[PDB]
RNA sequence: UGCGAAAGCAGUUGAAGACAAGUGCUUGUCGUUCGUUAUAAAUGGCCUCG
């Protein structure tokens, strides 16, 4: 998963309503119909300026614009393509409230103006849905009235949810049938949830529930694939349809630190159990199922970025993992300027690969049984060792071995309680700081034998221990996860026969043939000749290593003069080895007349 | 929340007395001959012979008296002694209990207690209202006493009076009529036959008279008697010999007659009621019916196991009762009782309990006597040394794994036991075996092994698993070459894929791969793929060299195929490998030696921390849920969150798991549910003031991430294995072959009279 | 039953020259025409024919040799020299091939089986030479 | 009791064509140009050879009718779908229609053109209309009722038109391929005489066939290409053939494991079957004495033995065929209870199998080494005896006379990879068991020396095998 | 027998009692004990129901 750099679509006009950045997203509406995975067009209603349709690719461009008076606010906007009585057409339905005195529902038909109509709506329009199949426009009002009109804005049906001050209404389709659910605040942080089915009445109420403890004033809401997501006080509350029961609560620690009032937060869905969260100029791609931060990006060139809408992928059915989202970005400066920007989002594969090790949520051995049978203080040690003077080997070993009750200079099965990595790494630092040059404590020998030797200190360990051959020999035998690159360099650099044998065995045991070969191609052409010349001067492992050496250098680079020695050398062992095999197996492996001399 | 409860049964109960021979069987057939009664180690089963189903089951736990009492049943007598569907059970200690079958078990049976002074009850028998009991008192030879038993209605007590005594009884047997006793003593040896309820028969004679001079010249096996049989009339006595020769002796004049067909030691000899017929059985897995009139023989070959006992059961010899041993399983003695028909020699009732194969022998199980000392048998001398060595191994040694592999079938929830070269399919809902199928080649039922042939090792089924769908079986087998050959050290590794349509009961071999992963490389681990990947028709196989191989079933080829490979040719060997797959199937955790590795499935290599180092070698890797991974190393266990890459909890296993279990057994001991949590098992050794054979186990229910213990329960015996049934409950197998579960008017009188008529 | 046997090494799904005849036989999958070409046992002909054989057709020849050797192991040796020269002459071309194991899996498996005989034959000959050395001196 | 286990001892698609085992090679007096099958039972096929057409009975596989009225060479023997009528062309250009099985009577004679008429095919959908192609390069469409004027005269071919095809389910389309390398499509109810569109093959077209309603396969030059009319382009192309492909035929819904098959002649003596379901990939082939000019297969509804027919320029005809107490019978239909318990006897065991079941170890080894015994079966009995643990036992009671047969096979079996390990197993035992008998017997010693020469040779081969394994690691 | 990989790396196979045979002595055995991790061979081969 990844987040792309935002690219500008258009620059928002300098209108007083749009000057309030915190409410700016409220004054920009995104049409649901034109904005999805496959559409290259976006219809956007900018309150007080216009409703404009843009093409995104190959370059952002303005395709259409319908002006609106500066005193009017776009409360709901939708656009959809279809067939109308049959000609292909585009139907745009938008609501404009002017000073709360009047609300205007407007429908425009364009040929792909064919027609335009305007009526007075009883209350502020919250959402608009366009049904091109039945040539219907469905408008939900703040007073709870759902009115179904034709394209001529003739009222065909009216339904009352019996509740006013409706705050949220979202449309969704399941199994080919259209559904809408609505939220209406009640007193004492109580909320009415209703689910309505669109088919004497084309609207059928399926569910009506009151959910308690549901506050709005500091809550950001979005819905996706039957799940309603509520972000509040840094916690994401997830509700399941068709009865809107709280399934799980996700605590997001990166928001609890935000001071209440100054930080701008936007929250939209992008895929199955994946959502987009922006905190001022930082954008987060989140995975709610696994509770992992898939990706993070900071827009250093803008003060804030507010998500408006996001094209959501149904990754369960879609092989596509790339989508887009639209938001408002505000620039830094004395005269801030707001612009509409599009971000390309790679959601990923929706697998546990994408979430591993990316959690946004931030030991000691304990007995198995709390309480007639067989038995087949890290900081205190740290401070005692740190309190020692420099280059005091005897005291350093004495404190370590005595305090930890270690009996052997090498790690043993009994030394497990010391296995805590935090304690060890500190002891490594103390050994390095306290002791430099040619004398190290015996404690290092014990830690070297430890299986959990820190990976951070593996690098250069051979170089540090080069001066003492005994420690260098120990590092080869048992020091865990030593980087292969260093051993290959030491293999061709060391002239001691015993170390050469020990290194090769360690490489073959702990690294694959493929892993060895690639790094081993990097080795200089002269160094390999020195090693090969060493060979010409347990061994099968070395010969296998030589077989690898012949592999990496390649037939071109081999110089015929030197090979003359090698075949004569290699043939010298084949005859020997065949001889030895023959020896190996062997150790595993009457007359009618006779003359005889009788003894009497 | 959770609770433990025994579910299945156990082994059939046998009269496990060394001296007693020809009377091991304790199961009795009803007087009406419509059902067969068999006592098990923990229950009593009444099987209707006609329908061949368990019509009634009596569990000791259900009744308080049997719960406290159960000591083993030494005999069953039809009806009640004190006084039409009653039976009297006699146990070794002396409890005489009258219970009922074909009905409801009464919670107050007529419990009684015979008085015995340092005497262990061995046998009882009756002819007509007269009851005699045989008892044991203690040169490694037990002595026997014959007492008379009568019930006095005044005191309601079983009085015992002395009748006879014999010392250093070696072998003993009772006639079919239950009225004659033949036995052997060291007073080399002498045979004596005595009438029980009368003084009519009283004869004794040294064994050497019967033994031939050639038998004296040859080895002890020729002079070693293995079985005794006595005719009802007492005229004929049959002697078996380890060499395989049968000698019928006429008691009137001590004249001998030699019948020689058995190549190995004869185990079971039994006379017919008339005496003209002799049933013989031994290691050959074949029954021989000897016509004494013409010295002819009829054969019933290819039995499931070697014959321990033979007997004719019927007023006219209608049924034969047989005991089979299944000697291939050296770890455990698997007894199966078979009721055949003289008419057509067909099985009217085969009964046997679950047949697990433990890694090592348990308790005091000893291999049966044979002509030679072999892997599956003991020679004459080898018996005492083997018994002492077994005891001292269970006492002093530390390796006490006794861990058996078991499998659960998702579609049917049947239990699969990978028996040696075969699978036993057993239903624990019904507590009855459903099938026994050979999955391999080899000498398994072609012929009966005898003498050096017995040293041959049949193929070993080491791993047996099901796919998530359950329509496929994956099996891994090892072929052992015959000894004393150049190719005596090249073990062959074989993998097999089988399919079975749900209606049928027999699995069909679909594919065979010879020498997977290469030659002489074992498949240490196998893991079926999750439902996400290839809709549950793929699998992974992992070696001791770290090589991983992913097979899949491809429709176009119509069989399994090798899809992905990763062959890192590591130079070191370790049998401690574990493998786990995510539910989504995206990632694979492979733990080799001390090092755990995370692999991307798509590229089948390292993800791009992928290496986690462990203090010791990893035995088990399992993910309780998609978030958490529980990894057990030889010293401890640790819960790791992949999301954080940090350890949440760590539990110290070394005090209990140090060298008691071989690597890889922790896999089959540790179990995990995919919804609620996992479970940890620890068996431990009990003692009061040096080690004792008895064992005690504890089961701990753990939540995901191991934060808390949902429950801590204890069982009084070594729980060999646990698996997680696909239901919430877990099923556990106990070395007594016990499967339990841990989990959350004139007209009315007229009608009565007519019904009686 | 009808279950098929398989081996774990089956990495399948994971003048005087006759060059023109060889090329046509390989292109047309004419086994009879390929057979007569393979019958030549003169090494100088094997090198020359493979010397002039186009590199693209040299690859598929390896598979053809692999299968023919697999069907008849007694022809392993005489066809060994053929594959010997193909690698010798077209070794550079084979290097510049995206994948070799999948296309030459049969040669891998066929070639591997012969090696596994070597350890046992040496054991057989060693026991065998001991006995032969016995009666020859006696 | 259980029954004794029995001793245990290509593509399904390929196995199907192997069943055409019987091969009858008939000699005709000139190159056989065209071969056709009658669409109905008995499905007797017609062959065009020299100046006559011969019909062959399917079962008898012999000529039953001969049409020799044609003065000049003959160029077609296609039947009408009903099979009652048989049409043929001549070098003179006259096209003649004969009632099948009635050579004497001419049903209809038309002179299509002065030039030769090489193709004459009845329209599969419509009985009345007959299509002819001539060296005049106009493929006239004639009718049985109208014998004096064509109904349509398709043109536009600038070279010889020798390939006419009718698209199944699409009477719309008449497909013609000329030696221009262009395949032309024509619509009949339209005005015609101008192709709907032309498909470029780039090589002279020898035969065009309609595999399916939308798939047209054109075999011309050294390759055959399959074109989809909807997409108007070649979906697949195969050029495995060496010589120029000449003829091609298609059969569908026949009892083989495949749903369909596609046979194509090569002119190289090769006829190969291709699988339309698998992108027209090679699945089987045959070889003949000379170039193949015509190939044919029995129709799907042959109703009996299937026939594969190959036509050669030599006049040789190759035919491969795949062949296809009054109460003793009461059966208790009316009875209440029916019981069946009769068990079939086991399949006959071989002599070696009987011995093993009877523990005749030595004799079983003897049965192994007998003349005319399959090599693989010999391994099984040897493997079983090793598996049973009876190797020394079978070799105990033996002398030199009965030991040689084992050694002889070991001399040959040592070479084989599969038997090499087994041979080493047995040869090891006989040596440790008959070292002294070897001392006193000369003949075996010679058997022993030659064993060294061969086993030594195998070491060289196995050694050489390990060497080449080195290359295959370096090359990768 | 221990460990380990399958290859292998280390370590064992003792003492007493009783019997038989041969000549107190010698040899062999043990349904006898204590302690250590610790060739075979009585002519004797697998049913019938196509």
Curated annotation (Swiss-Prot), chain A:
Task: List membrane-spanning regions.
Answer: none
Stored InterPro entries: Utp8_b-prop, Utp8_C
Give compartment(s). Answer: Nucleus, Nucleolus
Q: Does the keyword DNA repair apply?
A: no
Alphabetical UniProt keywords:
Nucleus, Phosphoprotein, Ribonucleoprotein, Ribosome biogenesis, rRNA processing, Transcription
A single GO molecular function term of this UniProt record: tRNA binding
Q: Which domain of life is it from?
A: Eukaryota
- Provide the GO biological process annotations: maturation of SSU-rRNA; maturation of SSU-rRNA from tricistronic rRNA transcript (SSU-rRNA, 5.8S rRNA, LSU-rRNA); positive regulation of transcription by RNA polymerase I; tRNA export from nucleus
Which stretch is the leader sequence?
none
A Pfam family assignment: Utp8_C
The Gene Ontology CC terms held by the record are: 90S preribosome; nucleolus; rDNA heterochromatin; small-subunit processome; t-UTP complex
- SUBUNIT field: Interacts with snoRNA U3. Interacts with MPP10 and UTP25. Component of the ribosomal small subunit (SSU) processome composed of at least 40 protein subunits and snoRNA U3. In the absence of snoRNA3, forms a complex with other t-UTPs. This complex can associate with pre-18S ribosomal RNAs.
Q: What does this protein do?
A: Involved in nucleolar processing of pre-18S ribosomal RNA. Also has a role in nuclear tRNA export. It acts between the steps of tRNA maturation/aminoacylation and its subsequent translocation out of the nucleus. Required for optimal pre-ribosomal RNA transcription by RNA polymerase I together with a subset of U3 proteins required for transcription (t-UTPs).
The miscellaneous annotation reads: Present with 16800 molecules/cell in log phase SD medium.
**Name assigned to this protein:** U3 small nucleolar RNA-associated protein 8
From Swiss-Prot, chain B:
Pinpoint the residue ranges of every WD repeat in the record. 261-300, 456-508, 518-561, 571-608
Where does this one sit in the cell?
Answer: Nucleus, Nucleolus
Q: Does the keyword rRNA processing apply?
A: yes
A single Gene Ontology molecular function, please?
Answer: mRNA binding
PROSITE patterns the record matches: WD_REPEATS_2, WD_REPEATS_REGION
Record keywords, A-Z? Nucleus, Repeat, Ribonucleoprotein, Ribosome biogenesis, rRNA processing, Transcription, WD repeat
Q: Which GO terms describe its cellular component?
A: 90S preribosome; nucleolus; nucleoplasm; peroxisome; rDNA heterochromatin; small-subunit processome; t-UTP complex
Q: What else is known?
A: Present with 6560 molecules/cell in log phase SD medium.
Role of this protein: Involved in nucleolar processing of pre-18S ribosomal RNA. Required for optimal pre-ribosomal RNA transcription by RNA polymerase I together with a subset of U3 proteins required for transcription (t-UTPs).
Assembly state and interactors?
Interacts with snoRNA U3. Interacts with MPP10. Component of the ribosomal small subunit (SSU) processome composed of at least 40 protein subunits and snoRNA U3. In the absence of snoRNA3, forms a complex with other t-UTPs. This complex can associate with pre-18S ribosomal RNAs.
- What is the protein name for this chain? NET1-associated nuclear protein 1
**Organism encoding this protein:** Saccharomyces cerevisiae (strain ATCC 204508 / S288c) (Baker's yeast)
Q: What is the lineage of its organism?
A: Eukaryota, Fungi, Dikarya, Ascomycota, Saccharomycotina
Swiss-Prot record, chain C:
Residue windows of the WD repeats: 52-92
Q: Give the coiled coil ranges.
A: none
Q: Where in the cell is it found?
A: Nucleus, Nucleolus
State the source organism's domain of life: Eukaryota
Similarity-based family: Belongs to the UTP5 family.
Its function, per the record, reads: Involved in nucleolar processing of pre-18S ribosomal RNA. Required for optimal pre-ribosomal RNA transcription by RNA polymerase I together with a subset of U3 proteins required for transcription (t-UTPs).
Subunit = Interacts with snoRNA U3. Interacts with MPP10. Component of the ribosomal small subunit (SSU) processome composed of at least 40 protein subunits and snoRNA U3. In the absence of snoRNA3, forms a complex with other t-UTPs. This complex can associate with pre-18S ribosomal RNAs.
Q: What else is known?
A: Present with 33100 molecules/cell in log phase SD medium.
- The protein here is known as U3 small nucleolar RNA-associated protein 5
Organism of derivation:
Saccharomyces cerevisiae (strain ATCC 204508 / S288c) (Baker's yeast)
- Source lineage: Eukaryota, Fungi, Dikarya, Ascomycota, Saccharomycotina
Swiss-Prot record, chain D:
Name the Gene3D superfamilies for this protein.
YVTN repeat-like/Quinoprotein amine dehydrogenase (2.130.10.10)
Annotated compartments: Nucleus, Nucleolus
Superkingdom of source: Eukaryota
A Pfam entry, by short name: UTP15_C
**PROSITE patterns reported in the protein's UniProt record:** WD_REPEATS_1, WD_REPEATS_2, WD_REPEATS_REGION
Listed as disulfide-bonded, the cysteine pairs are none
WD repeats, residue ranges: 27-68, 69-108, 114-152, 156-196, 200-237, 240-284
Q: Which GO terms describe its molecular function?
A: U3 snoRNA binding
Matching InterPro entries: U3_snoRNA-assocProt_15_C, WD40/YVTN_repeat-like_dom_sf, WD40_repeat_CS, WD40_repeat_dom_sf, WD40_rpt
Q: Name one GO cellular component term.
A: nucleoplasm
Annotated keywords: Nucleus, Repeat, Ribonucleoprotein, Ribosome biogenesis, rRNA processing, Transcription, WD repeat
Q: Where does the chain cross the membrane?
A: none
What more the UniProt record tells us is: Present with 358 molecules/cell in log phase SD medium.
Checking PANTHER family in the record gives: U3 SMALL NUCLEOLAR RNA-ASSOCIATED PROTEIN 15 HOMOLOG, UTP15 U3 SMALL NUCLEOLAR RNA-ASSOCIATED PROTEIN 15 FAMILY MEMBER
Function of this protein?
Involved in nucleolar processing of pre-18S ribosomal RNA. Required for optimal pre-ribosomal RNA transcription by RNA polymerase I together with a subset of U3 proteins required for transcription (t-UTPs).
Quaternary data: Interacts with snoRNA U3. Interacts with MPP10. Component of the ribosomal small subunit (SSU) processome composed of at least 40 protein subunits and snoRNA U3. In the absence of snoRNA3, forms a complex with other t-UTPs. This complex can associate with pre-18S ribosomal RNAs.
UniProt name for this protein: U3 small nucleolar RNA-associated protein 15
Source organism: Saccharomyces cerevisiae (strain ATCC 204508 / S288c)
């Amino acid at each position: 998963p990844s987040l792309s750099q935002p690219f500008r679509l258009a620059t928002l006009p300098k209108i007083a309503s749009l000057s309030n950045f915190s409410l700016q997203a409220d004054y920009v509406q995104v049409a649901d119909g034109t904005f999805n995975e496959s559409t290259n067009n976006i219809t956007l209603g900018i309150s007080g300026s216009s409703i404009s349709q843009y093409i995104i690719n190959p370059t952002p461009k303005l395709t259409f614009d319908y002006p609106i008076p500066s005193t009017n606010i776009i409360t709901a906007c939708n656009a959809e393509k279809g067939q109308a009585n049959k000609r292909n057409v585009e139907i745009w339905a938008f609501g404009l409230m002017v000073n709360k005195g009047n609300y205007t529902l407007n429908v425009i038909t364009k040929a792909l103006f064919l027609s335009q109509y305007k009526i007075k709506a009883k209350a502020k329009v919250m959402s608009i849905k366009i049904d091109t199949k039945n040539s219907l426009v469905i408008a939900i009002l703040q007073n709870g009235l759902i009115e179904i009109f034709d394209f001529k804005l003739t009222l065909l049906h009216s339904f009352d949810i019996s509740y006013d001050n409706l705050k949220y209404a979202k449309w969704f389709t399941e199994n080919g049938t259209e559904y809408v659910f609505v939220l209406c605040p009640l007193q004492d942080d109580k909320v009415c949830y209703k689910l309505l089915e669109l088919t004497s009445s084309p609207i059928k109420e399926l569910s009506s529930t009151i959910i308690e403890g549901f506050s709005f004033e500091n809550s950001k809401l979005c819905y996706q694939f039957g799940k309603l997501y509520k972000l509040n006080q840094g916690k994401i509350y997830i509700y399941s349809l068709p009865h809107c029961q709280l399934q799980q609560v996700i605590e997001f620690p990166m928001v609890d630190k935000l001071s209440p009032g100054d930080d701008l937060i936007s929250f939209q869905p992008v895929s199955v159990n994946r959502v987009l969260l922006t905190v001022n100029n930082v954008i987060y791609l989140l995975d709610l199922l696994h509770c992992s931060t898939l990706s993070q990006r900071e827009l250093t060139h803008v003060k804030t970025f507010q998500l408006l809408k996001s094209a959501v992928i149904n990754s369960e059915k879609s092989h596509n993992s790339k989508t887009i989202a639209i938001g408002i970005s505000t620039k830094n400066g004395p005269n801030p300027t707001s612009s509409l920007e599009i971000i390309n989002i790679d959601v990923g594969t929706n697998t546990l690969k994408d979430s591993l090790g990316k959690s946004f949520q931030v030991v000691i051995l304990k007995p198995l049984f709390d309480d007639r049978v067989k038995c087949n203080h890290c900081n205190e040690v740290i401070e005692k060792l740190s309190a020692l003077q420099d280059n005091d080997i005897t005291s350093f070993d004495d404190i370590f071995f005595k305090e930890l009750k270690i009996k052997e200079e090498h790690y043993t099965e009994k030394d497990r309680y010391i296995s805590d990595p935090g304690f060890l790494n500190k002891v490594l630092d103390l050994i390095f700081g306290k002791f430099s040059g040619n004398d190290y404590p015996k404690t290092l020998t014990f830690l070297l034998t430890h299986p959990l030797f820190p990976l951070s200190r593996t690098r250069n360990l051979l170089s540090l221990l080069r001066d003492q051959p005994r420690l260098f020999k120990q590092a080869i035998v048992t020091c865990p996860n030593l980087p292969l690159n260093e051993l290959l360099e030491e293999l061709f650099s060391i002239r001691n026969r015993e170390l050469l044998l020990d290194i090769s065995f360690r490489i073959l045991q702990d690294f694959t043939r493929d892993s060895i070969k690639q790094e081993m191609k990097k080795l200089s052409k002269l160094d390999v000749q020195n090693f090969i010349e060493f060979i010409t001067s347990q061994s099968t492992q070395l010969f296998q290593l030589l077989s690898l050496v012949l592999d990496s250098i390649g037939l071109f680079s081999l110089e015929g003069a030197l090979l003359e020695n090698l075949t004569l050398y290699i043939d010298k062992q084949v005859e020997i080895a065949e001889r030895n095999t023959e020896l190996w197996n062997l150790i595993d492996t009457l007359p009618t007349y006779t003359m005889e001399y009788l003894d009497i | 929340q959770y609770k433990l409860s025994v579910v299945s049964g156990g082994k059939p109960a046998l009269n496990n007395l060394s001296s007693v021979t020809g009377n091991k069987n304790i199961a009795r057939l009803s007087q009406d001959q419509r059902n067969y009664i068999i006592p098990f180690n923990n229950q009593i089963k009444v099987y209707s012979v006609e329908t061949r189903q368990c019509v009634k089951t009596l569990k000791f736990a259900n009744n308080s008296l049997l719960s406290g009492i159960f000591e083993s049943i030494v005999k069953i007598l039809l009806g009640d002694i004190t006084v039409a569907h009653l039976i009297t059970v006699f146990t070794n200690n002396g409890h005489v209990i009258v219970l009922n079958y074909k009905g409801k078990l009464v919670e107050s049976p007529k419990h009684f207690k015979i008085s015995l002074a340092d005497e262990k009850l061995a046998n009882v028998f009756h002819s007509e209202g007269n009851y005699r009991i045989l008892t044991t008192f203690k040169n490694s030879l037990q002595s026997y006493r014959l007492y008379a038993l009568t019930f006095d209605d005044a005191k309601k007590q079983f009085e015992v009076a002395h009748q006879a005594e014999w010392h250093n009884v070696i072998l003993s047997n009772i006639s079919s009529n239950g009225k004659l006793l033949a036995h052997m003593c060291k007073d080399h040896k002498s045979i004596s036959v005595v009438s029980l309820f009368d003084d009519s028969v009283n004869l004794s004679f040294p064994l050497g008279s019967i033994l031939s001079s050639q038998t004296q010249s040859l080895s002890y096996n020729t002079r070693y008697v293995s079985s005794m049989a006595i005719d009802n009339m007492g005229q004929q006595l049959a002697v078996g010999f380890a060499s395989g020769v049968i000698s019928i002796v006429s008691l009137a004049d001590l004249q001998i007659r030699l019948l020689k067909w058995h190549i190995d030691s004869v185990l079971s000899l039994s006379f017919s009621h008339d005496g003209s017929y002799l049933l013989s059985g031994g290691w050959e897995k074949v029954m021989s019916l000897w016509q004494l009139e013409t010295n002819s023989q009829q054969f019933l070959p290819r039995l499931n196991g070697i014959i321990i006992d033979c007997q004719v059961l019927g007023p006219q010899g209608n049924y034969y009762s047989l005991i089979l041993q299944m000697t291939e399983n050296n770890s455990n003695s698997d007894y199966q009782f078979l009721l055949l028909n003289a008419s057509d020699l067909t099985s009217k009732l085969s009964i046997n309990g679950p047949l697990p194969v433990f890694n090592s022998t348990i308790k005091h199980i000893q291999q049966p006597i044979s002509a030679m000392n072999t892997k599956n048998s003991n020679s004459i001398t080898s018996l005492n040394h083997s018994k002492k060595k077994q005891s001292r191994k269970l006492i002093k040694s530390r390796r006490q794994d006794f861990t058996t592999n078991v499998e659960i079938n998702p579609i049917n929830k049947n239990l699969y036991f990978p028996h040696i070269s075969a699978v036993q399919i057993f239903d624990f809902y019904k507590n009855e075996q459903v099938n026994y199928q050979y999955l391999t080649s080899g000498v398994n039922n072609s012929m009966g092994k005898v003498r050096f042939e017995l040293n041959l090792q049949d193929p070993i089924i080491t791993d047996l698993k099901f796919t998530k769908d359950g329509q496929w079986m994956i099996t891994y087998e090892i072929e052992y070459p015959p000894n004393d050959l150049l190719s005596s050290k090249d073990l062959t590794h074989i993998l097999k894929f089988w399919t079975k349509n749900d209606n049928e009961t027999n699995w069909n071999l679909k594919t065979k791969v010879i020498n997977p992963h290469g030659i002489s490389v074992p498949i240490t681990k196998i893991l079926p793929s999750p439902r996400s990947v290839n809709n549950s028709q793929g699998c992974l196989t992992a070696d001791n060299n770290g090589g991983l191989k992913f097979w899949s079933f491809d429709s176009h080829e119509s069989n399994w195929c090798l899809k992905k490979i990763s062959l890192p040719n590591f130079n070191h060997f370790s049998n401690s490998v574990s493998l786990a797959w995510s539910q989504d199937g995206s990632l694979i955790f492979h733990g080799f030696d001390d090092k755990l590795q995370i692999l991307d499935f798509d590229t089948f290599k390292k993800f791009e921390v992928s290496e986690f180092t462990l203090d010791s070698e990893i035995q088990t890797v399992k993910l309780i849920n998609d978030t958490n991974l529980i990894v057990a190393t030889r010293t401890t266990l640790n819960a790791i969150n992949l999301l954080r890459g940090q350890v949440i909890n760590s539990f110290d296993l070394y005090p209990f798991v140090n060298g008691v279990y071989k690597n890889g057994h922790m896999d089959r001991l540790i179990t995990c549910d995919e919804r609620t949590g996992n479970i940890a098992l620890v068996i431990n050794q009990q003692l009061t003031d040096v080690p004792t054979i008895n064992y005690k186990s504890r089961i701990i229910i753990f939540d995901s991430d191991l934060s808390t213990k949902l429950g801590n329960f204890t069982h009084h015996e070594y729980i060999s294995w646990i698996g997680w049934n696909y239901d919430t409950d877990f099923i556990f197998l106990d070395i007594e072959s016990t499967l339990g579960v841990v989990g959350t008017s004139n007209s009315d009188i007229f009608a009565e009279q007519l019904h009686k008529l | 039953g009808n279950a098929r046997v398989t081996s774990g090494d089956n990495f399948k799904h994971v003048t005087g020259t006759v060059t023109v005849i060889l090329s046509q036989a390989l292109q047309s999958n004419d086994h009879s025409l390929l057979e007569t070409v393979l019958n030549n046992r003169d090494e100088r002909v094997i090198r020359d024919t493979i010397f002039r054989l186009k590199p693209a057709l040299a690859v598929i020849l390896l598979e053809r040799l692999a299968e023919r050797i697999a069907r008849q192991t007694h022809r392993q040796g005489p066809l060994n020299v053929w594959v010997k020269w193909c690698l010798i002459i077209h070794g550079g071309y084979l290097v510049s091939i995206p994948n070799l194991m999948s296309t030459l899996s049969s040669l891998h498996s066929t070639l591997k089986r012969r090696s596994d005989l070597l350890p046992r034959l040496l054991a057989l000959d060693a026991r065998l030479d001991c006995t032969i050395n016995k009666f020859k001196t006696l | 009791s259980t029954a004794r286990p029995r001793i245990i001892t290509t593509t399904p698609e390929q196995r199907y064509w192997r069943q055409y085992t019987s091969a009858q090679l008939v000699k005709e007096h000139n190159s056989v140009t065209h071969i056709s099958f009658n669409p109905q039972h008995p499905h007797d096929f017609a062959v065009t050879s020299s100046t006559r057409v011969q019909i062959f009975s399917s079962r008898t596989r012999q000529v039953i009718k001969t049409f020799s009225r044609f003065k000049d060479v003959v160029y077609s023997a296609s039947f009408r779908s009903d099979g009652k009528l048989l049409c043929a062309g001549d070098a003179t250009g006259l096209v003649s229609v004969y009632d099948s099985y009635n050579p004497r009577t001419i049903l209809l004679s038309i002179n299509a053109s002065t030039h030769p008429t090489h193709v004459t095919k009845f329209h599969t959908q419509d009985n009345k209309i007959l299509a002819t192609a001539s060296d005049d390069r106009v493929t006239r469409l004639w009718d049985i009722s109208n014998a004096y004027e064509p109904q349509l005269e398709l043109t536009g071919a600038t070279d010889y038109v020798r390939t006419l095809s009718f698209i199944p389910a699409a009477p719309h389309l008449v497909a013609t391929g000329s030696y221009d390398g262009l395949i032309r499509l024509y619509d009949t109810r339209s005005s015609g005489s101008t192709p709907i569109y032309s498909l470029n093959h780039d090589q002279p077209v020898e035969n065009v066939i309609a595999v399916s309603p939308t798939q047209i396969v054109s075999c011309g030059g050294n390759n055959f290409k399959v074109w989809d009319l909807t997409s108007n382009k070649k979906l697949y192309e195969r050029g495995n053939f060496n010589k120029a492909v000449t003829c091609l035929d298609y059969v569908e819904n026949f009892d083989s494991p495949m749903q369909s098959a596609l046979i194509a002649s090569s002119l190289d003596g090769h006829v190969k079957v291709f699988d339309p379901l698998d992108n027209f990939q090679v699945k089987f082939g045959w070889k003949f004495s000379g170039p193949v000019l015509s190939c044919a297969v029995s129709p799907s509804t042959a109703q009996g033995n299937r026939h594969l027919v190959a036509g050669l320029s030599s006049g040789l005809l190759a035919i491969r065929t795949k062949k296809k107490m009054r109460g003793s019978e009461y059966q208790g239909d009316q009875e209440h209870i029916i019981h069946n318990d009769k068990v079939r006897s086991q399949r006959r065991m071989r002599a070696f199998e009987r011995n093993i079941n009877q523990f005749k170890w030595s004799e079983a080894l003897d049965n192994a080494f007998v003349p005319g015994m399959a090599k693989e079966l010999t391994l099984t009995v040897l493997q079983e005896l090793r598996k049973r643990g009876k190797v020394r036992v079978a070799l105990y009671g033996r002398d030199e006379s009965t030991l040689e047969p084992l050694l002889n096979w070991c001399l040959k079996g040592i070479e084989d990879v599969r038997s090499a390990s087994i041979v080493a197993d047995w040869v090891a035992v006989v040596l440790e068991l008959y070292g002294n008998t070897l001392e006193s017997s000369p003949v075996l010693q010679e058997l022993m020396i030659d064993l060294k020469t061969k086993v030594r040779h195998e070491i060289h081969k196995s050694k050489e095998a390990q060497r080449i394994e080195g290359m295959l690691q370096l090359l990768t």
